[PDB]
Amino acid sequence: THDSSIRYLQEIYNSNNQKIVNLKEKVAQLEAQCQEPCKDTVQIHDITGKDCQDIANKGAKQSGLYFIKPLKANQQFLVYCEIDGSGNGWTVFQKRLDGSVDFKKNWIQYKEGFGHLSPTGTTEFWLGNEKIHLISTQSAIPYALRVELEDWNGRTSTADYAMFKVGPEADKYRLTYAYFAGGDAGDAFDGFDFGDDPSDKFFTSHNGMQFSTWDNDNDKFEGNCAEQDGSGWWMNKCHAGHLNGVYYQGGTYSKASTPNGYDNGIIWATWKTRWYSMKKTTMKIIPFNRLT
C-alpha cells in the first residue's frame, strides 16, 4: 500500500507552497530598493544673484554651479563660480585643460556658449558672448579680468585687466579694457614685436577689437583670421593672445602641424613663443573693487 507515498507528496507540495509565499515577500522587499535612480554627482546650488561675487556675499562658501541673473538679463543661466576663503567670488567664462572640446565653432555657438559646466571645474567650455556681455555691463560697477595659464611643466602665470567689458552683438561683442593691471604672463593683449615688420605690434594688439568666427569676419585682415587659425576670438591681423585656439598635446607644435601655415595654438606671446600651446587656460571676471 502506497501509505507514506501520497503523504510525502503532500508534505513537499504544502512545503514549497509556503516557501513560495515567503520568497514573494522577499521579492517585494527587493522591488522597494530598486525605485530610486542612479545618484548624480553634479548638483546645482540654491543661492542665486547678479554674479558670483553677489552669491559669495550672500553666504556661498564652496565653488560650484549657481544660477545668476544680471540686471538686464531676461532669463537666468547656469555658471561656474570660483569661491575662495577670502570671500571673493569669480565668474568664470572660459576654460581649457585637455583637448576634449572642439573650439572651431560658428558665430551662434560662441554667442550662446558651448562645452560643459562641472561642479569640480574639470571641464572645458565657453560661456557665451551674450552672457559675458550681460554680466560685465549690468551696472556701472567696473569689472576686472584675470587670465590664468599653465604650461606643460606645472608653471602658472596670470594677466589682469581693469574695466573689462564686452559690448553687445550690435557691435560684434567688441572687447574693451582700460589698462593692463600687471601679472607675470605679460600684457599680450598689447601686441608683440615678432620681427622685422615695423607694425607687428599694431597688428597683433587686442583691446578694441571685435569678435570673429569663420562665418562672421570682423577682423582687420583682408583674409579671415578666425577661419585660418580655426577659432572664435577678438582678431586683428591677427593675434598675439589666442586662448580659444587648437589644443596641442604637449604644447610644442610646428608650422607643419597646422593646415594653413600659421600659429593656431593657445598662445600668449609675452610668456611663451607662439609655437608653444598652453596646457590649461582660464578667463574670469570679478568686480574691480574686490582686488583693490
Binding site: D200, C238, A240
Partner: peptide, 4 residues
C-alpha cells in the same frame, strides 16, 4: 601671429 602677424599677417604680412
Amino acid at each position: 601671429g602677424p599677417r604680412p
